[PDB]
Swiss-Prot record, chains B, D:
Its main location: cytoplasm. This is Tubulin gamma-1 chain. InterPro entries: Gamma_tubulin, Tub_FtsZ_C, Tubulin, Tubulin/FtsZ-like_C, Tubulin/FtsZ_2-layer-sand-dom, Tubulin/FtsZ_GTPase_sf, Tubulin_C, Tubulin_CS. GTP binds at A141, G142, G143, T144, G145, S146, G147.
């Protein structure tokens, strides 16, 4: 609820700062370092709001998908092409499936 | 992140901010000299938004307090809540001021202590690399809070241009004019700076205080010790989306952005119902949210002296209804269902209106997690009745030859009196023009 | 081995009591290009979990 | 191995080194006349790095104390810590000196006792076959510590060329100029020897002492009995990597090598927060390391009188942040994580900067194994403000015809005053040039 439904809005307010790092698409790099520094800054954004331990922070992962925004080449968005991925772990698998 | 620096200033602005910081420790579960309860982090999910961030789990207040009168600060250090304040951020021991009672005193004292007034208050600015803004917790009554407060509304407009300015300013009392007589002069000089040199204000009338102070509070002799009780709760009530974890309009630039129609129209009407302690014995039976906002639009909790028969040709444009603590949110859309059927708010015929409702969980405390609380931030166009009251008391005083020879000896060479009169009528004409 | 050779190059010109300073500057830019190539080799590791996050914090600490 | 010989010299340098050795016995678990506790070897893993190595488990201090005034040494032998000192290493009973108050007195007395001053202090040099270096624990105030201390900075530069030189020198007080008036003359003569005839210094201002001595210490009459309390702790704090078992920069040539940018730029800013005994009752709740280094870069604990508005065009190059005792090292990388987000240190635009943090376990003692301690060794380029303060007080005094006829009768035949002025401006110009 705190990181998908956004009812502790400090993470989604920090998403607005991640929305303040795109500013239109596409003008962003297409290197493989483009997921490398962008998967980090969302993990760094949770400590920027001072909430939660690292026990649930392993359940959040970010997968930067690839979609064209200049529409002939790729330069993927973070307004609608940045996605949080919740994890499936060892005891909790009857709660989370692939459809959800 | 979202750090706000409060600018407590004047004889009345320092006392209303003294219990504002004293209110914050009782709800954060902290002591002003220590941390004895563990309720500060499990119950409250955010604390470093008005306090300075911790060095030893000691949340320093981000506050500055300047006044010409040393009497307001000598009633502070003997109280046990002054050790939370620092004796190096603002002043050390034995701080003084002027003599002193004049609007031209603090207006002329701003440029002679210009080096020191822009030195120690800027040390708290670069503590966070993303500053929210400045709130001037000052006064309009007297010449102390009105004289020096008009200077900082000008020089902080260009030195810090990308910061939010919005003040919780208290209006003076207009019952008799014997002890003070300079009240129409120093008020309108600051009121010009509150519209063009300031974005938003939060009005707090004095004649409407004793309307509430004898309503349910049952006092016989009105003292100044009751003026801090109505004011300090609604200050902490206004930051419940900002201090406690909320989602939408959880910043101070979130709330004020959704209510201001235009510049020089920013005077927000405030309302707050629950102030009685014997209501507590009957809130155990699930007192709902369906009855608490029917009385907000009803003119009973208002803190603005306005006309009762002038609401038919005036129209609400923006109305805020903040519920706190236990809300029972399965019926909060049910409370907003009943708004359109009564039409207690007159709507503007040129554009849409908005009734915004929001919620946030309160402090883990027994008088807070049991009783429903409703904070109102209205915006109605009948606020020109106060501006008609102040202007009619302004031009009547200039025909009686009052304070025209006693006021222009120091630092006033030209007549700037009609410079305040036309700009006040510009506000009063654009309000009635705003509903076409 | 390139980093150890420049400090071997350093410690002999401090042992004496012209031309050595441009030999140092050419060997300074030589290992600067290789650590930038090493800096890309850390970030092209596996596109994975915190072992790229630890070595990223190596790389920003060497940058400021 | 790593034996350092301290050179305690002068009226103020002998008293700040007297309690420096008195601080070392309370943390080593030893008595100055015996060994009553077994905590000296199981708790402390290294003791023979400032003391002389033991002959009967009596760790002799490797100290020499010369002064013209016999008053500083007559307040020593009645104290019970003087039996640890030896009456044959420096002087026997009834040692004296000059009359005497002059910079030219001790500068001329160095070559008339030249045979004896290089005889008994060299007996401690060949005790260890690998000598670390020499620290001149001398003073700048007065003519006693400044007159004779400038002589040993020259003759020990070539007789011992492969040894580290670095001093913990105290700066004099510049409040009024009534009791002493020779203060601009004897200070700049030693300050030239501190840059070209000496590698590094550790500055200790006097006007910044009473800024801290009335900050949290709460005194009304400033005495000289408080000058030894701030100084003796940070001296033992600087050798915590060297005395207690550490790994990196565990030598005195380890710490100073990672902070000096260039010769004649070695003036290091010092900071030390925890000096209050009533903090002890709230450190039981796991006070962390995440809040102790947020206030080091904040200019509150500094011992250097510098400008507050001169830090925007100046840049930090090297900053040391030493934590001691209980560190909780699983969050010490977490404390260094928050440094880049604030950028409280301005970084040099030509090259990289460095925030070095290190730790070492403290003494097995209850006020030491409970409360977090932070020692700062900064290096900021705003240190020319003190050099602009001393030079502006130097050329103004030479135009008033002050001490030009009263100072050149003994051993001064040519004007060496502009020899100190240009070399001081060479330091002040190369500091601002260093950030291109």
């Amino acid at each position: 609820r705190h990181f998908l439904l956004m009812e502790d809005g400090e993470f989604a307010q920090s998403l607005s700062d991640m929305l303040f790092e795109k500013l239109g698409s596409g003008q962003t790099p297409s290197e493989l370092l483009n997921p490398l520094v962008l998967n980090s800054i969302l993990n760094k954004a949770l400590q920027y709001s001072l909430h939660g331990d690292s026990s649930l922070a392993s359940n959040l992962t970010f997968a930067l998908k690839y979609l064209p925004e200049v529409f002939t080449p790729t330069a993927p968005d973070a307004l609608s092409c940045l996605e949080l991925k919740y994890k499936v772990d060892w005891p909790l698998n009857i709660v989370i499936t692939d459809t959800c | 992140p979202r750090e706000i620096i409060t600018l407590q200033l004047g004889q009345c602005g320092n006392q209303i901010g003294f219990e504002f910081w004293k209110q914050l420790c009782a709800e954060h579960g902290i002591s002003p000299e220590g941390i004895v309860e563990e309720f500060a982090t499990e119950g409250t999910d955010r604390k470093d938004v008005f306090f300075y961030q911790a060095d030893d789990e000691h949340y320093i207040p981000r506050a500055v307090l300047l006044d010409l009168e040393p009497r307001v600060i000598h009633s502070i250090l003997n109280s046990p809540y002054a050790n939370l304040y620092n004796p190096e951020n603002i002043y050390l021991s034995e701080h003084g001021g002027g003599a002193g009672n004049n609007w031209a005193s603090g207006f002329s004292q701003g440029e002679k202590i210009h080096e020191d007034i822009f030195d120690i208050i800027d040390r708290e600015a670069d503590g966070s690399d993303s500053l929210e803004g400045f709130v001037l917790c000052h006064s309009i009554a007297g010449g102390t809070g009105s004289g020096l407060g008009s200077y900082l509304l000008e020089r902080l407009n260009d030195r810090y241009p990308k910061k939010l300015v919005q003040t919780y300013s208290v209006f003076p009392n207009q019952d008799e004019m014997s002890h003070v007589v300079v009240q129409p002069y120093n008020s309108l000089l600051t009121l010009k700076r509150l519209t063009q040199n300031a974005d938003c204000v939060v009005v707090l009338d004095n004649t409407a205080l004793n309307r509430i102070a004898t309503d349910r509070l049952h006092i016989q002799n009105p003292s100044f010790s009751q003026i801090n009780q109505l004011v300090s709760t609604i200050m902490s009530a206004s930051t419940t989306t900002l201090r406690y974890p909320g989602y939408m309009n959880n910043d101070l630039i979130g709330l004020i952005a959704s209510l201001i129609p235009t510049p020089r129209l920013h005077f927000l009407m405030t309302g707050y119902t629950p102030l009685t302690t014997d209501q507590s014995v009957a809130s155990v039976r699930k007192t709902t949210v369906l009855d608490v906002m029917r009385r907000l639009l009803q003119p009973k909790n208002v803190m603005v002296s306005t006309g009762r028969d002038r609401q038919t040709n005036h129209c609400y444009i923006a109305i805020l209804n903040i519920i706190q603590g236990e809300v029972d949110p399965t019926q909060v859309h049910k409370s907003l269902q009943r708004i359109r059927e009564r039409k207690l708010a007159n709507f503007i015929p040129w554009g849409p209106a908005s009734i915004q409702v929001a919620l946030s969980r309160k402090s883990p405390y027994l008088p807070s997690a049991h009783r429903v609380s409703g904070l109102m931030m209205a915006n109605h166009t009948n606020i020109s009745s106060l501006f008609e009251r102040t202007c009619r008391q302004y031009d009547k005083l200039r025909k009686r030859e009052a304070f025209l020879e006693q006021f222009r000896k120091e630092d006033i060479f030209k007549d700037n009196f009609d410079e305040l009169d036309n700009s006040r009528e510009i506000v009063q004409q654009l309000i009635d023009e705003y509903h076409a | 081995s390139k980093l150890m050779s420049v400090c071997v190059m350093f410690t002999n010109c401090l042992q004496r009591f012209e031309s050595t300073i441009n030999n140092f500057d050419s060997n300074f830019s030589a290992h600067l290009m290789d650590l930038l190539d090493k800096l890309s080799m850390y970030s092209t590791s596996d596109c994975e979990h915190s072992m790229i996050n630890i070595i990223y914090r190596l790389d920003f600490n060497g940058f400021y």
